[PDB]
Structure formats: C-alpha cells, structure tokens
Amino acid sequence: MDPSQYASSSSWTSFLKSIASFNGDLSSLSAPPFILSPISLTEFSQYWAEHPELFLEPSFINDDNYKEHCLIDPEVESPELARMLAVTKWFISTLKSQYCSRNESLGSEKKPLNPFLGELFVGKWENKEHPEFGETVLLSEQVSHHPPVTAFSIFNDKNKVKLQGYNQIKASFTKSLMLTVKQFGHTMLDIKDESYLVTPPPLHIEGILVASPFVELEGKSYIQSSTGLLCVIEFSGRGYFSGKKNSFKARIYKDSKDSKDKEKALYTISGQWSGSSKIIKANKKEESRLFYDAARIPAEHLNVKPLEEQHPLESRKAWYDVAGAIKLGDFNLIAKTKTELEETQRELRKEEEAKGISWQRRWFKDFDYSVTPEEGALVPEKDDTFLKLASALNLSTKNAPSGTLVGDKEDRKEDLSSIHWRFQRELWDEEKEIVL
Ligand SMILES: C[C@H](CCCC(C)(C)O)[C@H]1CC[C@H]2[C@@H]3CC=C4C[C@@H](O)CC[C@]4(C)[C@H]3CC[C@]12C
C-alpha cells in the first residue's frame, strides 16, 4: 500500500493493539511487512566511520602542526585540544549515519533484522583517493542473541587509529506509544597512544501512531580523553531547548571537575547533528564559526565483498532469502524465510544444550569487570584503558545504561553485573576463514 494508507491499515491497527501487551522483547510484536527493513543490526557498526577523513584526522595532528589542523581555531591552545575538537567533530558526524540512514534509504525508521548468534559483518574502507589514509577495516559480530548484543572494531593499522565497542538496548513503550530506548555499552577510540571513551545517548522513537517512525536523541553522551579533556554532549529536539529537531549542545572542558560548571567550557558547540552546528570559543559569542554541516559531506559506505564470496555467517549472505522476501512484500514468504532461519538457530541452541556444548564467540570475549568475577571468565588487565577513562569521568563500570555516573540510581542497583565485550585482535590475525 501507499504510505498514506499505513496508519489506518488493519495490519498497523493490529500492531498497535499488541503494544498494550508488550513483554519487553521487541521481536514479539507483529510488525507488518511495510515496516520491515532488510538490514540486520550487525551492519549498524559501520555507522561509526562513514566519514573516513574525520575518523583519521586526529592521527595527523602533532606538536609541530596542530595549529594548521584546527579550522575553527588556528589559535587553539594545544595539540591535545585540537585532537579533542577533531574527535568531537568525528563523533557528531556519526550521528546522521547512526540515526537517519533508514529514513533516507527506506522512507522512515523501520524494524531491523534481529541478528542471529554468531552473525558477522565485515568490510573495509579502501580510501583509494587518499593513499596516506590506508585501509580501514570493520569487524562486527553478534555476541549475544538473548538479549541482542553487537560487538565491533574499526581499525586503521597505517595510522594507528583503532576503535572497539559493543551495543545493546532496553526498550519500553509509554502510554502515548513513544518507544523509549536506553542504550548500553560504550566505545573506545585509540589515536596512537591517546585514548577516548565514548558513551552513546538514550533515544526515543516518535511517529509510531502514524506509522512513520523516526529517531530523536535525548540525554547526554560523553567523550572522555586520556588527556583529561572531556566533551559533554546534550541532545534535544523540536522545542524547549532548541528551535529545531535533532539538536545538540556540546561543551569541552579541561577535565571532569570543570564540567560541573558550564562557565568553564573551553568551547561550546550548538546546532543540529543532522544539519549545521556552530562553535563559540570561551564566551566570545559574537565570533561563532561553522563547526560541521552534515549536508555538505556525503557519507562514504564501506566496501563489502559480493554475496557470491561471502561466508555463511556473513549477514547479507545469511539473510539473503529474508531480505528478498521483505523487498517483495510477500507476507507469507517473509514469515517462511525468517522462521526457517530462526528455527534452525533454535535447533542449534537445543542441540548445544543437550550435548553440553557452548557457542564460542569469534573475535570478541566478555571480560568480567566485577570484584568477584565468574571463575572461568576472562579478567581485565592492570592498565586497562576503560578503567582509567571511566575513573576520570567518574563513570559507572557496571552494566548500567550508557553514560551512567557513579552514584546514579542505575549504578546503585542491586546485583548488577560488570561484564564488557572486548576485541581480541589476535583472534582476527589468526582468522582462517573470513576475509575482506
Ligand atoms: C528495534 C527498533 C525498531 C522497532 C520498530 C518496531 C517497534 C515497529 O518493530 C530500532 C529503531 C531504531 C533502532 C536503533 C537505531 C540506531 C542505533 C545506533 C546503533 O549504533 C546501535 C543500534 C541502535 C540503537 C538501533 C537499535 C534498534 C532500534 C531502536
């Protein structure tokens, strides 16, 4: 049907009625074919680096050239600050990819494919037009199905820029049918020997009643550097804190302590992350400059090998039949193909249980950060980067919502684990089957 027919359709009405009985698992809802996306969540990891030049920029800034690598402030105080400004610009640049890509390619936000345990998605940004850049690799793996958890790493060996992280969510519907989403997990970016800890923001899905879903961000995100510098990004939409949707205000401080006083902000950035934003240095409001305009720089999609040469665990290869059925809009075929894949997985889980076998993750391992870890689990190292960055930001190391600070209600929750997924580069180095 035409999108103008979605909202009043029998299918959508049935879907909305099933929300009143939501059990916490989004996959239990009856999503009509018109609201389905043929893209799996394991693919979302690619949204962290669709602007290759911004991802790598920090690695080109040093003590001898930093003032030439800060467009909005050729008088920037230090290379550490120039790099924080670059990391902040990169982070803001990821937002349109992360949260607006389906609206552009599908017409609205839609239900992504729920990845199967073990699902992989790999590719690379060859950066052919920039030999100094080198190849940037993406590795994404579904490390959990119950609940869904995606782990990923994006790395550029040539310039020593590496990123790793994981993601999972908890969702709930309000009585007004707003889908509230809390993200869990964090991402770490290493620029040579300098590190940055990034926490994703909470969000909500609007437009459910009218069958035209879209994401709006809320809350805050943090970017804590090993240099002590901290960027605090606050999100809002429509009105109340801004005159337009997809808005934000970011402030960079010398350290976490200073972030307690907005007046101590070294720079203040404001605007729309899906559009343009300006930056002000100190309190010189009369001298604002353009910081980033998402509309001027088209996203660069990574190179993925043809389906013909993909391993059975690779996302597009595995979901091929379902994706085809979704594109055809065939109700019965979508049900048939999806059930075939998911039933096969259920059978595997039951077999492993009967034989006393467990599923082994491929390139990531869960590290128990709790004081009393499981006797067989892996434990963090001495100079763990996450621990030092979390300490500097006074961030909870428990499995609380992303960005939870020590002492917050979520951090004071009883019997809360502290297990975090970490990339094991050695496992990729010794990979014997998967290629790019
Ligand atoms: C599961 C729901 C859709 C449910 C639709 C329904 C209720 C009709 O089935 C989707 C919609 C928006 C999706 C998020 C979009 C962006 C991101 C950022 C990425 O880095 C991690 C995944 C995440 C949080 C998506 C999760 C799934 C979401 C909420």
Side-chain angles (χ1 to χ4, degrees):
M1 61 188 93
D2 183 77
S4 65
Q5 298 177 295
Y6 293 174
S8 61
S9 74
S10 296
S11 293
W12 199 247
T13 305
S14 293
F15 166 72
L16 295 179
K17 289 184 174 298
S18 70
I19 293 178
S21 305
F22 184 51
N23 58 47
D25 192 314
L26 289 173
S27 297
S28 64
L29 305 180
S30 64
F34 67 71
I35 207 66
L36 300 182
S37 162
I39 308 171
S40 167
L41 279 162
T42 61
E43 283 202 42
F44 283 48
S45 303
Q46 75 197 94
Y47 299 143
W48 284 95
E50 291 195 315
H51 288 106
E53 81 277 22
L54 297 179
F55 180 66
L56 302 175
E57 179 56 15
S59 77
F60 298 116
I61 303 176
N62 55 60
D63 292 358
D64 296 291
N65 70 14
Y66 74 96
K67 299 178 70 175
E68 308 167 8
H69 288 265
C70 198
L71 296 183
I72 54 78
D73 184 16
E75 290 180 52
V76 64
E77 187 61 45
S78 69
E80 291 69 33
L81 188 54
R83 286 193 294 273
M84 171 56 85
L85 283 164
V87 171
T88 295
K89 188 175 180 183
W90 160 72
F91 175 65
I92 294 302
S93 82
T94 71
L95 306 176
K96 184 181 176 179
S97 292
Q98 300 274 198
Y99 309 111
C100 303
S101 293
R102 283 72 56 197
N103 284 76
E104 301 183 301
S105 67
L106 309 180
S108 74
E109 187 56 74
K110 290 195 176 185
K111 180 186 170 188
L113 293 169
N114 185 203
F116 55 92
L117 178 63
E119 188 178 322
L120 305 174
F121 183 63
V122 307
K124 60 184 173 182
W125 282 273
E126 300 189 299
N127 297 313
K128 296 184 64 179
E129 295 64 57
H130 300 286
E132 66 272 46
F133 282 12
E135 183 186 75
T136 295
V137 179
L138 164 67
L139 300 181
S140 187
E141 167 174 23
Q142 196 64 7
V143 296
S144 183
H145 174 69
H146 194 78
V149 183
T150 306
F152 47 87
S153 186
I154 295 176
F155 51 91
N156 180 277
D157 291 346
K158 184 176 184 63
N159 293 285
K160 312 178 194 308
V161 176
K162 58 189 178 183
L163 171 159
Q164 70 166 119
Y166 76 92
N167 179 274
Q168 60 183 296
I169 64 174
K170 283 194 173 176
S172 63
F173 292 88
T174 60
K175 295 179 181 180
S176 64
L177 308 186
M178 184 74 92
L179 179 57
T180 302
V181 180
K182 296 185 180 179
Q183 297 200 62
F184 287 72
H186 52 268
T187 289
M188 292 184 281
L189 172 72
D190 293 299
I191 306 297
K192 296 192 189 308
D193 298 311
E194 200 165 85
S195 297
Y196 297 79
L197 172 59
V198 184
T199 60
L203 61 85
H204 56 278
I205 308 299
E206 297 186 50
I208 290 184
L209 180 59
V210 293
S212 187
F214 68 85
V215 175
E216 183 55 283
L217 304 180
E218 63 185 65
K220 306 177 180 179
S221 277
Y222 299 104
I223 301 178
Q224 175 68 63
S225 179
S226 55
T227 62
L229 296 177
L230 169 71
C231 182
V232 182
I233 306 91
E234 303 175 65
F235 299 101
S236 59
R238 265 187 171 181
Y240 110 63
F241 206 63
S242 180
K244 291 181 294 182
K245 65 176 184 181
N246 302 164
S247 296
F248 75 94
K249 195 164 191 179
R251 292 185 181 77
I252 295 167
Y253 301 89
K254 294 185 176 299
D255 53 55
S256 183
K257 298 176 181 179
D258 279 40
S259 74
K260 304 295 182 180
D261 189 327
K262 283 66 174 180
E263 197 180 310
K264 297 182 183 299
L266 304 181
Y267 297 89
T268 301
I269 305 165
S270 63
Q272 295 179 295
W273 45 264
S274 55
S276 57
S277 56
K278 67 181 181 183
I279 184 166
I280 295 172
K281 184 175 186 177
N283 306 300
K284 314 305 176 182
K285 308 174 183 180
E286 298 291 297
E287 301 175 0
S288 71
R289 300 179 176 181
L290 179 65
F291 180 71
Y292 181 66
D293 183 350
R296 300 303 296 286
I297 327 296
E300 293 183 51
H301 304 143
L302 88 173
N303 167 291
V304 183
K305 55 187 163 301
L307 284 170
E308 299 60 56
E309 43 187 291
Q310 280 176 42
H311 183 283
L313 287 183
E314 292 186 65
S315 189
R316 297 175 181 176
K317 186 74 170 184
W319 290 106
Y320 184 73
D321 291 342
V322 176
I326 287 174
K327 292 179 183 176
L328 191 62
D330 192 319
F331 191 88
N332 296 325
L333 189 60
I334 293 169
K336 183 182 179 63
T337 56
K338 182 178 172 220
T339 297
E340 188 173 307
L341 186 157
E342 303 190 318
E343 171 59 12
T344 296
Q345 288 291 124
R346 281 190 285 279
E347 289 164 49
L348 288 172
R349 296 295 92 72
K350 295 180 179 180
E351 184 181 62
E352 303 174 332
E353 181 61 58
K355 184 63 189 304
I357 298 301
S358 62
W359 175 263
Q360 299 171 174
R361 280 58 180 179
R362 212 180 185 90
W363 308 309
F364 305 80
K365 300 298 176 176
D366 49 339
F367 283 65
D368 201 322
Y369 278 68
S370 68
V371 179
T372 58
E374 300 188 4
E375 299 184 358
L378 299 176
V379 175
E381 283 301 302
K382 309 176 182 301
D383 305 301
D384 186 69
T385 299
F386 177 61
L387 288 178
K388 73 175 185 179
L389 297 181
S391 178
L393 175 58
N394 190 50
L395 183 80
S396 171
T397 56
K398 300 186 175 62
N399 288 139
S402 302
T404 299
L405 287 59
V406 177
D408 287 2
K409 177 180 181 179
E410 293 291 52
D411 179 56
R412 297 186 176 184
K413 184 177 180 180
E414 302 178 301
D415 54 289
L416 185 59
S417 59
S418 299
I419 301 175
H420 301 294
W421 293 94
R422 298 284 179 253
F423 177 55
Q424 303 300 83
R425 177 57 183 268
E426 301 74 7
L427 299 183
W428 167 243
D429 292 335
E430 55 189 58
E431 172 59 48
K432 307 172 185 180
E433 298 178 353
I434 304 297
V435 297
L436 304 174

